[PDB]
Amino acid sequence: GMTMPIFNISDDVDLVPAMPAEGRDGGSYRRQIWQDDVENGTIVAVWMAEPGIYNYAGRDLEETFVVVEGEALYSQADADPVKIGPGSIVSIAKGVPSRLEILSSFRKLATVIPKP
């Protein structure tokens, strides 16, 4: 029959370099999985990152992600970092800055709703 649209988050395939970690010029990668064919459509993508520090300014979008592999110290805005790991699910509102201090090779599936 036909092959189903099933992917393995662990597989390093079609990963495109994304944000580098502080102090070096590499660290994270993104793999788009699905995008709606409407303007400002919902996007689902894999983000993988190696240990290091990743700072994100507030962005014009809503995101919810789930961690499948790895651990990180995570914060939004002025909150003290909290440890997240496999099974953690995180939502971050439009315009809210965030920081990930990745502790071990980390993979999340992220749902992004553009809010231009």
102 contacts its own copies (rule: CB under 8 A): no
8 contacts Cl ion (rule: CB under 5 A): no
Region near Cl ion per CB under 5 A, out of 12-20, 40-48, 58-66, 79-87 = 79-87
Cross-sheet strand order for the sheet of 52-56: 52-56, 98-102, 72-76, 82-84
Strands 16-20 and 52-56 come out as: unpaired
Nearest approach in angstroms of CB 90 to its own copies is 5
The answer to whether 28 and 107 have CB atoms below 8 angstroms apart is: no
40 contacts its own copies (rule: CB under 8 A): no
Which residues are within 8 A (CB) of 26 and not within 5 positions of it... i.e. 6 or more apart? 17, 20, 50
CA gap 110, 90 in Å, rounded: 9
> 46 to 85, contacts with its own copies by CB under 8 A?
46, 62, 64, 66, 68-69, 74-80, 82, 84
Nearest approach in angstroms of CB 17 to its own copies is 20
23 contacts Cl ion (rule: CB under 5 A): no
43 to 6, 48, 65, 70, 87: CA distances (angstroms): 16, 16, 11, 22, 20
Contacting residues toward its own copies, per CB under 8 A: 1-10, 33-34, 36, 41-42, 44, 46, 62, 64, 66, 68-69, 74-80, 82, 84, 86-93, 107, 109, 111, 113
